[PDB]
Structure 1
């Protein structure tokens, strides 16, 4: 009969935040991006449609407050162009401008704009004052557009092609309302989740390809949101906050989460040979971190799936891949494959391994650095997922 008309918000797009100024031990300080009387227009693909939306902004890693002078949303028509008749002001407790203290995030008021799944919207932010923005999603695999003055409502962003970025600045979630029964699948992980080496602006990240499979099968109310961070590790900060410390924010607290796909750990193994020799971790320490995350998510009623760590022999031999890294990988994957605690294994390693040599990525799926898949590899990852377990 009639679907009960109680409406709810659902995460329809996400990006995990990193501190752009955070660096490895012994590394030189890194500068954050700044804006000064400038507009940045982000573009993002919605997983879930619905009748109204909310924008979550972030100063999580600011060292002092920032002020969003104006925030607007519109349907994107490609590049920096918007459908101007859909342009809406984003307000926060009724205000067009909002100040976020250092370390805080904020969900906007509801915006009355009906949106459809697998379509792109533009979220434009104007910063009138000098604004340090260390809170970013570094690897957007998506062009952002920066221009002078308040261009938040402009049809297109007027500036130089050098005034482009591929990051998201203080923009961490897009939530969309619906009365329909809805699943939200959070993909949690490192660059292989984030989509490094997938084609920029082409929505070829494996979660995008998974989303495509769901909608093709008719499941327009099963959403997939991306909580990958390129370079991320379970047990140590950089790149991005440690998987253990960000798991509550980036998985448990995602609006409407029902399912999680966890693929994380290869950087815990790879970083210790050279990038961070003081941060060696055992397979046991990685398994303990995974266990605690799994327990926390199951206690919330989330279905938890864990991916096996994909082969990476050939990845900067002796400086990322090592025999020690491989032994830890095998121990972790044996633990995953035999775990009775998780709701299911997604054997990404089996889907992507070289049939000629199981310790390497299949050459047809190799972006060329022996570690990150290409578009075909990310599509193959999505094809390896049983859609019935996301119900």
Structure 2
């Protein structure tokens, strides 16, 4: 009667040189990373990705523990993961691995420290640069629960880790969210776990009816839906990052500003607008065929940002009109209406953005999550 439901995930990509780990690098080193789950549970599995690496990657050991903030853990909580009973595993080029199931007291919104000791790794690294969370690197094998990381090399990126799922009853399910930096959390506080999907998770957990609903943030900073951008496009990654998650019953699509922002003139921008509409229809249809409800987020303002052009704003309005009026999404989450300045509706609210008039700040992300009707997540 129980099956796997995702509680935390992060979308993988090939890490760009500028986002690579600092010295001493991952090979023959130990890396501690912190994630913030949504729903809690008692039996977990941990997923690790090598999808964008062309060499095998060996994890000599992986441990999990309750994070106490920073690089510290509660050592009495530490447990070793296994992979077919063994502590060590090698991922094949392009492939992922899933740990053996493990018992762990996972509480809602718990901060979990995942500590990996690596052997040989791949210089093309699979990871998630926009972690909004500091990770900690030490040379050598520092897998003891009493290892001192207080002086580890800090890096504000995630590498390798991909998801945590837990066993749950029929009442439990997850929302998967596809987006760019506005969803990945540029402008949110580092180590504050306060991206808009985190704020939604908080609202769900506090509302008794939605307490068993988890949140899978598949945002990628700088991502595009159609072509270009950072990381694999939303269309390319849709199957892996959305359709293959466990227990997903709803998908929020909130993405496309970077496609619009890349266009050099009216004709290209109008073509992107139609391309985004077609891509939304495609992803709606594919999710529907798997029983998933799809909610569309309107693209938020860009005036006063580096992206603004009169013809890009036109394309944004074309897309938003289709989101609001086509009826093809199962419901509309009107982030544009929530985030736009009432006195200048083409620009973000000044106090709710990070200075660039594109990415919200922490208040903005709370306003965004607060504008979501939780009755959209029933059963």
TM-score, length of structure 2 as denominator length: 0.94
Question: Residue 334 in 1 paired to residue 324 in 2?
Answer: no
Match of 1:165 in 2: 155
Match of 2:354 in 1: 367
Distance (whole Å) between structure 2 residues aligned to residue 160 and residue 146 of structure 1: 9
Provide the alpha-carbon RMSD of the alignment. 1.9
Distance (whole Å) between structure 2 residues aligned to residue 50 and residue 59 of structure 1: 26
Q: 2:332 aligns with which of 345, 351, 354?
A: 345
Q: 1:295 aligns with which of 261, 285, 293?
A: 285
Match of 1:26 in 2: none
Q: 1:14 aligns with which of 9, 28, 42?
A: 9
Structure 1, 201-210 or 216-225: larger mean CA deviation: 216-225
Unaligned runs of 5+ in 2: none
Distance (whole Å) between structure 2 residues aligned to residue 281 and residue 150 of structure 1: 52
- CA apart distance, 1:31: 7.6
Instruction: Describe the superposition over 1:205-230 as per-residue Cα deviations: whole angstroms up to 9, x where unpaired.
Output: 00011111111212320111110001
Match of 1:382 in 2: 369
Distance (whole Å) between structure 2 residues aligned to residue 133 and residue 197 of structure 1: 27
- 8 Å Cα contact 1:70-1:97 kept in structure 2: yes
Match of 2:138 in 1: 147
- CA apart distance, 1:180: 5.3
Instruction: Describe the superposition over 1:295-327 as per-residue Cα deviations: whole angstroms up to 9, x where unpaired.
Output: 1011111011000000111111xxx22112111
Match of 1:196 in 2: 186
- 8 Å Cα contact 2:56-2:121 kept in structure 1: no
Q: 1:49 aligns with which of 17, 32, 40?
A: 40
Instruction: Describe the superposition over 1:42-70 as per-residue Cα deviations: whole angstroms up to 9, x where unpaired.
Output: 10111111111111001111011111111
Question: Residue 185 in 1 paired to residue 185 in 2?
Answer: no
Distance (whole Å) between structure 2 residues aligned to residue 387 and residue 279 of structure 1: 34
Q: 2:108 aligns with which of 94, 117, 120?
A: 117
Match of 1:282, SS? helix
- 8 Å Cα contact 1:128-1:149 kept in structure 2: no
The 5 Å alignment of 1:41-120 reads 41-120=32-111
Distance (whole Å) between structure 1 residues aligned to residue 200 and residue 143 of structure 2: 32
Instruction: Describe the superposition over 1:93-130 as per-residue Cα deviations: whole angstroms up to 9, x where unpaired.
Output: 11211111111111111011121111111111111335
Question: Residue 313 in 1 paired to residue 303 in 2?
Answer: yes
TM-score, length of structure 1 as denominator length: 0.91
- CA apart distance, 1:75: 1.3
Cα 1:57/1:315, change in 2 over 3 Å: same
Q: 2:200 aligns with which of 198, 210, 214?
A: 210
Distance (whole Å) between structure 1 residues aligned to residue 186 and residue 253 of structure 2: 17
- 8 Å Cα contact 1:190-1:228 kept in structure 2: yes
Match of 1:272 in 2: 263
- CA apart distance, 1:132: 2.6
Q: 2:224 aligns with which of 224, 233, 237?
A: 233
- CA apart distance, 1:131: 4.4
Distance (whole Å) between structure 1 residues aligned to residue 148 and residue 131 of structure 2: 18
Cα 1:18/1:130, change in 2 over 3 Å: closer
Match of 1:69, SS? strand
Unaligned runs of 5+ in 1: 1-5, 22-28
- CA apart distance, 1:285: 1.0
Distance (whole Å) between structure 1 residues aligned to residue 219 and residue 148 of structure 2: 28
- 8 Å Cα contact 1:352-1:381 kept in structure 2: yes
Match of 2:104, SS? coil
Distance (whole Å) between structure 2 residues aligned to residue 302 and residue 170 of structure 1: 27
